[PDB]
């Protein structure tokens, strides 16, 4: 079960890396094995102080245990943080690493599991709350106060592992956070509504 | 080849449009449809992914060509010049009536 | 109710020095309203966290948003990448 589970992950990450070549990047040992929140600060320590991800499977660095897929998680996150800081934020390979990181993390998060408010004082008094919660990373836009137009911008495609300071092409820009809307969907109207007889 | 200028901006759709199904004469890029810049009236269910490239050898009649033929007869009810370019312009007048009957 | 509003505006000052990430005209598109962030497109219409059957106060911190998105297994994707070539 876990033997194919190393092979099926490996067969995807080689074939899903032809346009971006993250897996064939020059990657040293980089033995941190720390908190994944520390995975760049220990690497920033590694830059100040001083075997690739394809060759990690080939050297058998990854065992059929959680730690063998934790190092598989640790070494992948090290390469993408190298490649995000290498490229500027507008190049195609910056977002190609950003697209490959989001896919490979989504591939590793699953399949290892297979193997104070007056409104709340009324509703919890009135209802029974079966609950479900989760985390989501939001994006940002710009905010411009022009002459009563109150302009907005598009979504900046800066990755979540960029960690660069807030530069501004204009200081009269304001910056706003776009909260993502997620719930049960409002019921779409029927097919007679969309495509009626005109 | 036609050009398909994206609605609610001035960009050009490269090879794929998001044809509105209630405005029925507007197209969108993927980016203008991803972030919901088509105005608060439309509900993102009245947007069929349509393509802008030239199709294969003729008398094939893909469902994009079939629906865009079916939109025009609901639009115009005549003027098979105005139906044939609505299919994409790569189909003759003599073939759309031969397809419709 | 009109359809032909502009909703896309361009400031005349060419500030295209640090702007390679945003949406350009080819100048910067400045829309009338903000963006829409959607988590997932395909919903899982089964999955009794959402279906709510009428049989039998509990919380459940599910792992991420990817439970409700219909993803396939890597075993078949390896079975399909072997079906690739």
């Amino acid at each position: 079960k876990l033997v194919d589970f190393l092979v099926n992950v490996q067969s995807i990450l080689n074939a899903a890396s032809v346009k971006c070549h993250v897996v064939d990047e020059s990657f040293p040992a980089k033995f941190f094995e720390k908190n994944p929140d520390k995975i760049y600060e220990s690497y920033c320590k590694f830059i100040k102080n001083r075997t690739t991800i394809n060759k990690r499977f080939e050297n058998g660095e990854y065992e059929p245990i959680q730690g063998g897929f934790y190092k598989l998680y640790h070494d992948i996150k090290l390469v993408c943080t190298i490649l995000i800081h290498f490229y500027p934020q507008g190049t195609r390979n910056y977002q190609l690493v950003d697209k490959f990181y989001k896919f490979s993390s989504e591939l590793l998060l699953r399949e290892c599991c297979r193997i104070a408010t007056e409104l709340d004082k009324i509703i919890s008094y009135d209802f029974i709350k079966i609950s479900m919660n989760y985390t989501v990373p939001i994006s940002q836009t710009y905010q411009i106060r022009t002459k009563d137009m109150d302009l907005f911008s598009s979504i900046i495609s800066k990755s979540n592992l960029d960690k660069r300071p807030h530069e501004l092409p204009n200081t009269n820009f304001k910056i706003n956070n776009v909260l993502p809307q997620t719930d049960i969907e409002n019921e779409a109207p029927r097919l007679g509504f969309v495509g009626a007889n005109t | 080849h036609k050009v398909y200028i994206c609605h609610t901006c001035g960009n050009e759709s490269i090879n794929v449009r998001y044809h509105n199904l209630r405005a029925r004469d507007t197209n969108l890029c993927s980016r203008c449809f991803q972030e919901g810049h088509f105005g608060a009236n439309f509900q993102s269910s009245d947007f069929i992914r349509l393509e802008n490239n030239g199709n294969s050898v003729k008398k094939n009649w893909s469902d994009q060509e079939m629906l865009l033929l079916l939109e025009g007869i609901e639009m115009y009810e005549d003027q098979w010049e105005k139906i044939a370019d609505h299919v994409g312009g790569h189909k003759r007048v003599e073939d759309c009536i031969e397809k419709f009957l | 109710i009109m359809i032909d509003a502009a909703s896309s505006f361009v400031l005349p000052i060419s500030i295209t020095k640090n702007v390679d990430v945003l949406q350009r005209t080819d100048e910067i598109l400045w829309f009338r309203g903000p963006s829409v962030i959607v988590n997932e497109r395909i919903i899982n219409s089964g999955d009794p966290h959402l279906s709510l059957p009428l049989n039998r106060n509990e919380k459940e911190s599910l792992p991420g948003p990817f439970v409700l998105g219909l993803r396939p297994s890597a075993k078949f994707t390896a079975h399909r990448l072997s079906m690739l070539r």
């Binding site: 106060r145 | 080849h1 398909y4 200028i5 901006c9 001035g10 | 505006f9 361009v10 400031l11």
Partner: peptide, 29 residues
């Protein structure tokens, strides 16, 4: 910067739908 009324980009719906991309049809000299 708040006296910087921007340029509206008009779509002109007929240009959005079906504009194609005359001496090259040689019947007019």
């Amino acid at each position: 910067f708040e006296t910087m009324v921007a340029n509206p980009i008009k779509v002109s719906r007929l240009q959005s739908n079906g504009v194609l991309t005359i001496h090259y049809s040689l019947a007019n000299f």
